[PDB]
Structures are given as C-alpha cells and as structure tokens.
Design a protein around this ligand. Structure first.
Ligand SMILES: NC(=O)C1=CN([C@@H]2O[C@H](COP(=O)(O)OP(=O)(O)OC[C@H]3O[C@@H](n4cnc5c(N)ncnc54)[C@H](OP(=O)(O)O)[C@@H]3O)[C@@H](O)[C@H]2O)C=CC1
Ligand SMILES: CCCCCCCCCCCCCC(=O)SCCNC(=O)CCNC(=O)[C@@H](O)C(C)(C)COP(=O)(O)O
Ligand SMILES: [Zn+2]
Lengths: 86, 95, 114, 134, 340, 126, 208
C-alpha cells in the first residue's frame, strides 16, 4: 500500500560508506523536510556493509546494497525506494 | 507454642504449613507430620536477663569447650539488652 | 595441518571401512534379533542401523571417521559375542522416553527449552 | 494477561543512555508458567496465522542486527555523528517555552526508591521509603 | 491453579507433571501399566490398595521419591474413598473382576463401587473422573458382566456429568486374561468353541495404546464429558485369532465345537472354586460376544495415539507359553491372520 | 610421507558422545571471571572460564530441593588464553560468545593530594 | 624449619639430575624436557612418537633397568591444543627408583601402543580408551574396560560432566532396565572455593 519506514545503515570510517556519508550532510535535511511522516532511520555502526532497508505495508521489506556508492547513486536508489511504494 | 492452621495441620517453628488446596498434604494422609513442639524462641524467651556488674561481658554458652566460641558483648544501652549472637542469652549492666 | 593418520590416508579408505562396517552390521542383525530374542523384526533393526549410520553422515575428516569405524567395530565386537544384553541392544530403541515435541508451539507450552 | 519474564530471567539486550548495548544472562528461570517475552510474542504470531521468521534467540538477534546493527555488538559504543543536520531540522518547529519552571520529578530521597514495576513490589524499598520519610 | 501442581522439567522421572491421580485398583492389569506410564512423567499418584501390601511392592520402582502414596481402602466405605480422592485433581477407576466372589458380585464391583467413587469424586472438587467400561457393555446383553457394567456406566454418567468414560474392546498384555487365556486351553483339551468360533468378530487393542489414550485424555481438556471407544486397527474372527495364537505359540491346534447348552455346564465345573477360578460361563459369554463397531464415538486416532496392531505385540505376549523346541522362533516365522 | 593433509574443520562433535540436544541448544560463554567485590584479590581474575547458560531449576516436591534436568549445568572449564578457549568451543561445536578482559586501569594515586593547598581534592578528615 | 617441614633429600635430587642429564644426552630424538621435582622425583618429558624407543631403553639398558610399569595415566588438560598427557610410571627394582615418562596427544592423533615393551599396559592404556578417548593403535584387544557396554562418550574428559547423559531405571512396560535422560533429585551444588588471594608466590606465572 506504501512505504512505512526507511533504514539507512553506514560506517563512520569505512570508505564504502563514504558516498553514503556524502548523502547525509549534503542532502538529508531537505530529504527530511520533504518526508515529515516518513521516518528515515540513520544507523551508524563500525564494520557493517552500507545498506538501505525499506519496510512497506503488511510487513514486507526491500533491501538495497550501498557498497562504495557515490552520492547520486544513493540518491537515485533512495528516490526509487520512495517512488516504488511496493 | 505450637498452633494449628485452619487446615487442621500443626504449624512448624519456621512457619511451614500447607494451605487448603495444596495436594502435598496427601503425604500425611494416614500418617503424621513429625514436628518439634519445643520451640527455640519460646524456650529462650523464658530465660532471664542476666544482671552483671561489668561494662563488657564474656559469654561462652557454658561448659567451656562444650559451647559456642567465647564472644564479648558491650552493654552500654540501657534500652536494649546485650544479646549473645550464638546462644540467645542476654545481659544487662546493673547500673 | 600435517598430522599422523590412524588407518586411512584420505576419504577413499575411510568410506571403504564405513562400507565394510555396514556390511558387517547387515550380515549380523538377524543373529542379534535371534539370540537376544527381541520382539522387533529384522526390518526394524536394519532401519535402526540405517538411522545410526545416517546420524553421523556429515563428517569430512578422515581421522574422525576412522575413529567412528573403530567405535562401530567395538559395538560390533560386543554385539556378536554376547557381552551386551537385551537392555544394551534395546537402548538404541528409545521405547520408554516420552516423545520429544519438535515444533515451536509445543516447546513453548511444555517448558523453557529452546 | 500474558505473564512474561523479569530481567534476571531472560537473556536480553538492554541499552543504556549512551548507546552501549548489553545483554543479561539467565540467573533463574521465570516462576510458574511465565515465559520469555519474545517467546510469547513468537507463539502469539504462530497462533494468529502471521508466523514470524525466527525460532531461537540467535535468529532474533540476526533480525535485530537487520533493524539497527549496534544492538548485537556488545561493550562497543558506536559514536553518532551529524548534529548540525538535526539542528537544522530543529529550527523549523518554532515552539513556545512555558513560564513554568523546570521541576524534575525526583526532588528528594523519598522519590528515589519507588519508581518502576519491581521497586514498587519490594518490602526493602518500602522500609527505605518509610525510613526516609521520618 | 496452585504453584506446586504447575508442570516442570523435561517430563522425565524426576520432573513435575502436574497430575495428582488416584488410580483405584492400581494393583491389577491396567493399573500396573498406568502407574508405569504416569510415574515416568512425575505425577503425585495415589494408589489405594485393598490387597496384601507385598502385592503392591512392584509399584515402588515406578516413580520418584514419594510420588506414589500407598493407602488402604474398602469398597463398601465412602470414608476411605473421600480420604483418598480429596487431594487428587484426577481420579481414574480401574476396579474390575472378571468373575464373581462371595463378598462381591458383579453388581458391587460394577454398579455400587463405581457410582460410589464417582459421587464422592463429585462432592470433593475433582476436575476429571475417568471410568473404564467395556465396548460390549449393554443392557440387553447375555452376560451379567456387561449388563452391570452398562448400568454402572449410566450411573457414573448421571452422577458425574464431566466423567470421561472409555471403552476398551479386549485388551491384551503380558498379564492379560485374553491371549494367556487363549493359550491356556492346551491343558483342558482341544480349545472348544461355540459354533466353531466363526460367528463372532473381535478387534483387540494393546495396553500401551490404551494407556497412552487414558493419559492423553487426562492431559487434554477436550475429554470432559466425552465417551471414547478404544479399538484395535484390525478386526478378526475368533477362529483364526485362536489359530493365530496357537501358531505364534507353536502348539498343536485341534479345535472342536462344544454346544451352546453343554459348555456352560463345563463353565459351572470351574466356578465351584474358592480360588481364582480358571474359567466361567461369563468369560464364555464375553468371548462369544462380538465387538460392536461404534463409528459415532471417538477412538485412539482422536487422541493423537497411533494404534499398534496385533502382529507386533502378540509375540511379546506369547513368548512365555512356548516350549523349548520353538522357544526362539522369530516374529516373521508365522503366518498373519485373516482380517475381516 | 607417513603424514596426511587435512584441510577440514576440526570436528569431534560425533566422537565425544555428547547428544545434539546439548550441542546446538547451548550458549557457551567464554569470560574472565569477574572479581568479587567483597574481597580485593585478583587471583580469581587470571584464567578464562567457559560456562554454560543456566537451565531450569525447580522444587523437588518431596523435599524442596533444587532439582534439575541439565546435564551440563555444573560445568565451568579453566583456560589460559582466549585462543585456546575459542578453539575448544569450536572443536566441540559449542555455539559460544566471548566477553573481553576488563582490566583495572592504572590510577594516579598521590598521597599529598589529600592535603592540597587550593584544590577540591582535600580531605575533611582522616 | 625442624618440626613441621618435610626434610629435604638433596642426594636423590642430585642423582636424578645426573640421570636426567644421562638420559637427555642418550636420547636427543624424543626427550623434550627433563625436570627433577622438589621432592626428588624425575620427569622425562618426551614426544609421542617415542613411546617405543624410550621405554625399551629404560626396560633394557644396564644403567636404567626400569623393569615394572607401575602406573599409566592420562591427565586431560583442556587449555592446551594437545589436551591429553599420557604419564608412564616406571619402577626399577635393581637401582630402586621411579621415573615418570610424560608425553602428549590430542583426540585424533593416535599413540603407539607399548604392549611390545611392557605387557602390563595391556589393560592400562585400554582404560585410557575407555575413560579419555586416546586411541592406541596396534593393541591386542582394545575396547572399553570399565564403563557400561552401551556407553557413549569418554568419562574422565573434563568437557564430560560429573553426572552423565543417561540414567537407568527398571521399566515394567518393557520388563527392562532402560536408559533415560538424567534428572537429578538434587542438583550437584558446585562450590566456588578458589580464594582470590595468591596462595604461593613461588608458583607465580608472568603476565601478558
Ligand atoms: N481384558 C481386560 O483386562 C479388560 C478390562 N477392561 C476393564 O478395565 C478395568 C480394569 O481391568 P483389569 O486391570 O484387567 O483387571 P484386574 O483384575 O487386573 O484389576 C482390577 C483391580 O480392581 C480391584 N478390585 C476389584 N474388585 C474389587 C473389590 N470388590 N474391592 C476392591 N478392589 C477391587 C482389584 O484389587 P485387588 O488387587 O485387591 O484384587 C484389582 O486391583 C475393569 O473395569 C475391566 O472391566 C476393559 C477391557 C478389557
Ligand atoms: C542392532 C543395532 C546396533 C546399532 C549399532 C550402531 C553402529 C553405529 C556406527 C557408527 C559409525 C559411523 O557413524 S561412521 C559413518 C560416518 N561416515 C561419514 O560421514 C563419511 C561420509 N560417509 C558417507 O558419505 C556415507 O554415506 C558412505 C556410505 C560411506 C558413502 O556415501 P556417499 O558415497 O553416497
Ligand atoms: Zn553466648
């Protein structure tokens, strides 16, 4: 029926999270200013592969890997997550 | 000072008796719950407070090496008796 | 990782000894059912020997299956000679245990066991 | 009422105020028929035709790592960055401060002892509250 | 629900199972195996014993410390019945005599005592009462056994409405009176039968299945007020059943028909004894009563119990009655009987 | 040659005779045993211990004793290094978890700092 | 140091040091350590491929003559990688002394049987198969000697707990003594008696 929550996991120090880090300081705020009712949970760990989780209606989830992606690839994947609603 | 619970069963000196719906009374059906009716607290409540003329009193339970190890009791509070830790005897300074 | 073998150099001789041990059990089981005068048939005993061999069928280490052949041959040595009794043979057949519930909801119901 | 486990009665991940994930260990088992909490929720999902994709605590902690990946890495503070973006988000909602002074709910030693569902059922905490009243 | 009667453990010998079962007549055939299968769970079992205490000694290795409480009782006294059932959360009735004695007829064993136990179990707060009738117990039957047992069943149903009344057909075990009976007429002659024993159909059930059914009736609260019917999975005629017993026992089998009017005259020849009599006309009228089929009543498959057939356990029953010349013949070295 | 090359996982889970029920359903815990605060000695914080998860302990209905059904309840094994304890858990197929060593940090104990001139760390008594 | 202190025998101490020097320079192929304990008993710590060459020396050589295999012992120590430690105890009647030949193995590596040297080991190492799981290759009749016939596992291994995994009871359903999972009447109360003050300063190990 539609998206319910976004979960974005990333490292602090690994370069594989680097563009994901370049997503957050540059573009997250006007992302959150665009989606007030949609919780976008940033979770930073130390050693995880950067990932993108999307819980939809009735408990189903989608899973996008974000390893070594830059800012525009993460941005296109996230707007595909937003525009999917499946 | 043994008493009877409302299930007809005698109370121990610990406070142990089975309640109304507990099935474990069935082990006493036709037999007896062997308890001791000489309670320790009742037989030591009878003993008198020993008036001694010293500030610090030495208790050893009587018998020398046949009782508890010999401890020393302070007797400064006139409100409270100086109860021995092992034997339950209690002392009071007489002034 | 360069260790000393027991009998087998690799898994070929190991599977050979496992296979000869199972040959020995398949030859032996009617004598076991006869002289222990068990109430089971030969078919159920051979099903149990199949279950005991498929219980350990995931080993990839040649020394471990060498020692398993050794322990199986000791079980065989004590079964052929009457050194075991009716109880020692029937301890494989878990007849007296309550059947252990496998699914999650019954394990939730009967206790704290995961 | 679905009676659950206490905190000394289940292996259980709790997180302090600084984000350090910790696990309890089973001291005693829960009394009576009371079960571990997620065992109750998993059996309730099995009854309700919406069976959750786990059985044991390891699969629960794999799920919990999927949700946020710090909750299964114990004795390791994961430092959280990015304060200025939360500050920029905070400037949008202009909210009025009240004229009421900041009063904490725990002023004296009497309000310390009885707060939660364990400390209200304690006779030791009852003796402490009764003893700090007078 | 009390805290001590909450189940605990792995369900072994020293577990707690939460069953407090008073098993009346636990010294006999069904009571032996029922205390066996209750004591391996950890039940505080009350055994009321009438007989010599020595005859109950083999019930002591069947449980943990103090799980079996032995106590005296009398059948004509509600005082000891109330004394035994007042702490039990389940009462099981296994009182029966396959013959009549001086002090007790069929009625005092099947009408007076079961209604007495059921009435006192009602007026003592018992959750579950279980009565064990017989599958052929009917008011219009030929044997006084079955008539008194149906009268007592109707009384128990009208005095304790949540009583689980269970119908076994013909139980066989190591200590039965069914297969050992059929193997003890190589002494008298050539096992005589009414009308060649071909007009009666039986289906016997093994005692482990009946005991699992009784305990799964204790555990399940779906057994309140029901009326089960424990039957074997395969039906047999009587003639090839007796021939199968004498082929498993490996005996000379030469049957001959003894008529319907002169075999009760041999039935009175053995019931003149103050001992346990060898046979009687009541056992004749019960062997020659065919097992009715009751499809509208539940059975072993309605308790999650898989019934074990006769060809797996008849060897277990009948290895005792063999001579040495075929003492160790195998289970597969016999022909299976002809089911109907 | 007289030596074989085995590149497999070291697995004696089928030779020790321990059933599957207590190999995959136990959480072994490898830990420096933490110091009892009643005492000040650290001789019981020197060697690692492997413990197991505590199973059900119930009332024995006859005597109130703590009956149990866990065969591996009262087992605590002593190891010298963390590598040997981890290799012992992985050799027996025991699903484990390891808590690291919590040493006491070196403090800065000075005696004159109790009697300072202008600091908050003066004592009011002794 | 007179009344309650055990008197020291420096003579057997020095003689076992000299005999340990002797054995360590006769056998440099397998003898790994030589230590004289503080109460004058020698320990010759060898390699597990030297069961037959060393013990045939001590049984036969005219300066050793360790004629009798007194005791044979495995000591399971789980904190090693070669967790089992086979201990040979040898009594020499002519020189009137005792020596201790210690060696090591883990589970899967076998130890060569010494019934060709000492026939007395015919049972002793057999016990080590029954109790510990150390397999002895080239043994006449190797099997269990002490435990039950249908017994799975090795008892004196320290991963094996005090009470086993099977208990017995008579069962009158099947007329048979059967083995069931153990449920104790009382749990074995484990006592943590290790006092955390350092008892012996002469046995302190250096830290990390
Ligand atoms: N073939 C079978 O066994 C079948 C039996 N049933 C039914 O199952 C029940 C139990 O049968 P089963 O175990 O084989 O019979 P048993 O003869 O083996 O045992 C019956 C028990 O009842 C006791 N009892 C009988 N009469 C009295 C009495 N007047 N006073 C006191 N105690 C008495 C006996 O006590 P004591 O030991 O003192 O004599 C005995 O313990 C009966 O109701 C029977 O009809 C149903 C189907 C088949
Ligand atoms: C009467 C009852 C008495 C019961 C006695 C029980 C005896 C138990 C003996 C146990 C001996 C063993 O478990 S050794 C077998 C384990 N071996 C292995 O896992 C090695 C791999 N084995 C296999 O792949 C086996 O399937 C085969 C048969 C060797 C070959 O199969 P693959 O080829 O396709
Ligand atoms: Zn005193």
């Amino acid at each position: 029926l539609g998206l319910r929550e976004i979960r974005i996991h990333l490292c602090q120090r690994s370069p594989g999270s680097q563009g994901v880090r370049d997503f957050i300081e540059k573009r997250y705020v006007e992302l959150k200013k665009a989606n007030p009712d949609l919780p976008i949970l940033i979770r930073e760990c130390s050693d995880v592969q950067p990932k993108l989780w999307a819980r939809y209606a009735f408990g189903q989830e989608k899973n996008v890997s974000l390893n070594n992606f830059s800012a525009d690839q993460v941005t296109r994947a996230l707007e595909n997550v937003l525009s999917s609603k499946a | 000072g043994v008493r009877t619970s409302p299930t007809g069963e005698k109370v121990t000196h610990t406070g142990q008796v089975y309640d109304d719906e507990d099935y474990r009374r069935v082990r006493f059906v036709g037999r007896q719950k062997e308890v001791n009716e000489n309670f320790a607290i009742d037989l030591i409540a009878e003993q008198p407070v020993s008036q001694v003329g010293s500030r610090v009193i030495s208790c050893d339970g009587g018998g020398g090496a046949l009782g508890h190890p010999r401890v020393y009791i302070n007797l400064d509070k006139e409100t409270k008796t100086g109860t021995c830790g092992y034997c339950g005897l209690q002392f009071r300074q007489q002034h | 990782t360069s260790v000393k073998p027991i009998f087998s150099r690799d898994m070929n001789e190991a599977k050979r000894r496992v296979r000869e041990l199972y040959r020995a059990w398949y030859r032996e089981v009617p004598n076991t059912v006869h002289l222990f005068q068990l109430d089971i048939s030969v078919k159920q005993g051979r099903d149990k020997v199949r279950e005991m061999f498929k219980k350990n069928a995931h080993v990839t280490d040649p020394r471990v299956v060498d020692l398993l052949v050794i322990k199986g041959k000791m079980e065989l040595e004590e079964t052929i000679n009457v050194w075991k009794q009716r109880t020692h043979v029937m301890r494989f057949f878990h007849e007296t245990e309550a059947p252990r519930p496998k699914d999650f909801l019954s394990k939730f119901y009967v206790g704290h066991d995961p | 009422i679905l009676p659950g486990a206490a905190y000394t009665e289940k292996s259980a991940t709790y997180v302090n105020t600084e984000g350090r994930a910790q696990q309890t260990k089973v001291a005693v088992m829960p009394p009576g028929l009371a079960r571990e909490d997620w065992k109750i929720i998993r059996a309730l999902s099995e009854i309700a035709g919406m069976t959750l994709p786990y059985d044991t605590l390891d699969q629960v902690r794999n799920r919990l790592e999927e949700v946020s990946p710090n909750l299964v890495r114990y004795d390791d503070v994961e430092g959280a960055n990015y304060f200025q973006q939360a500050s920029e988000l905070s400037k949008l909602v202009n909210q009025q401060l009240l004229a009421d002074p900041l009063v904490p709910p725990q002023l004296t030693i009497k309000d310390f002892y009885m707060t939660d569902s364990i400390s209200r059922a304690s006779q030791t905490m009852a003796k402490c509250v009764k003893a700090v009243t007078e | 629900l009390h805290h001590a009667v909450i189940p605990h453990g792995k369900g072994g010998r020293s577990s707690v199972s939460g069953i407090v079962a008073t098993v009346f007549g636990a010294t006999g055939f069904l009571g032996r195996y029922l205390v066996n299968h209750l004591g391996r769970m950890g039940s505080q079992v009350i055994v009321p014993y009438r007989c010599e205490p020595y005859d109950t000694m083999h019930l002591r290795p069947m449980g943990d410390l103090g799980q079996i409480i032995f106590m005296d009782w009398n059948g004509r006294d509600k005082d000891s019945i109330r004394r035994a059932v007042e702490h039990s959360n389940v009462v099981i009735n296994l009182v029966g005599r396959e013959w009549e004695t001086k002090n007790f007829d069929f009625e005092d064993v099947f009408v007076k005592i079961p209604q007495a136990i059921a009435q006192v179990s009602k007026e003592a707060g018992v959750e579950k009462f279980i009565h064990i009738s017989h599958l052929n117990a009917d008011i219009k039957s030929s044997s006084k056994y079955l008539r008194n047992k149906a009268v007592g069943e109707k009384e128990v149903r009208e005095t304790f409405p949540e009583a689980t009344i269970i119908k076994p057909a013909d139980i066989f075990g190591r200590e039965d009176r069914f297969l050992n009976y059929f193997a003890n007429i190589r002494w008298f002659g050539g096992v005589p039968l009414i009308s060649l024993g071909k007009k009666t159909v039986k289906q016997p059930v093994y005692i482990v299945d009946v005991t699992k059914g009784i305990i799964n009736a204790i555990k399940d609260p779906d057994a309140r007020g029901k009326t089960f019917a424990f039957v074997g999975p395969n039906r047999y005629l009587l003639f090839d059943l007796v021939q199968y017993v004498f082929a498993v026992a490996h005996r000379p089998f030469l049957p001959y028909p003894m008529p319907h009017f002169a075999y009760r005259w041999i039935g009175r020849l053995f019931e003149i004894s103050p001992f346990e009599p060898w046979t009687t006309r009541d056992k004749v009228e019960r062997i020659h009563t065919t097992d009715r089929t009751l499809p509208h009543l539940p059975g072993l498959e309605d308790l999650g119990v898989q019934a074990t057939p006769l060809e797996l356990k008849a060897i277990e029953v009948l290895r005792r009655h063999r001579t040495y010349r075929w003492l160790s013949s195998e289970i597969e070295d016999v022909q299976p009987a002809k089911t109907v | 040659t007289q030596l074989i090359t085995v590149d497999e996982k070291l697995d004696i889970t089928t030779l020790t005779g321990v059933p599957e029920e207590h190999i995959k359903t136990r959480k072994a815990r490898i830990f420096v045993p933490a110091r009892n605060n009643m005492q000040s000695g650290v001789n019981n914080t020197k060697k690692w211990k492997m413990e197991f998860d505590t199973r059900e302990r119930w009332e024995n209905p006859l005597m109130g004793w703590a009956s149990t059904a866990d065969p591996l309840s009262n087992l605590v094994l002593t190891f010298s290094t963390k590598e040997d304890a981890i290799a012992f858990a992985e050799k027996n197929g025991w699903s484990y978890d390891v808590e690291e060593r919590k040493v006491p940090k070196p403090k800065s104990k000075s005696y004159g700092a109790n009697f300072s001139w202008n600091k908050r760390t003066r004592v009011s008594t002794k | 140091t007179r009344p309650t202190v055990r008197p020291r025998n420096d003579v057997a101490h020095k003689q076992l040091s000299a005999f340990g020097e002797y054995v360590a320079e006769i056998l440099p192929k397998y003898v790994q350590q030589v230590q004289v304990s503080c109460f004058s008993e020698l320990e010759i710590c060898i390699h597990p491929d030297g069961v037959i060459p060393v013990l045939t020396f001590l049984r036969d050589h005219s300066n050793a003559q360790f004629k009798s295999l007194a005791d044979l012992t495995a000591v399971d120590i789980p904190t090693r990688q070669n967790r089992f430690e086979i201990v040979y105890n040898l009594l020499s009647l002519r020189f009137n002394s005792r020596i201790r030949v210690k060696t090591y193995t883990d589970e899967l590596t076998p130890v060569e049987s010494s019934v060709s040297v000492y026939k007395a080991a015919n049972w002793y190492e057999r016990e080590i198969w029954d109790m510990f799981g150390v397999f002895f290759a080239n043994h006449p009749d190797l099997r269990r000697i002490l435990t039950d016939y249908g017994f799975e596992g090795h008892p004196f291994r320290k991963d094996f707990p005090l009470s086993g995994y099977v208990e017995l009871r008579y069962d009158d359903e099947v007329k048979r003594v059967v083995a069931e999972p153990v449920e104790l009447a009382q749990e074995f109360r484990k006592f943590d008696l290790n006092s955390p003050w350092e008892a012996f300063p002469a046995y302190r190990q250096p830290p990390e």
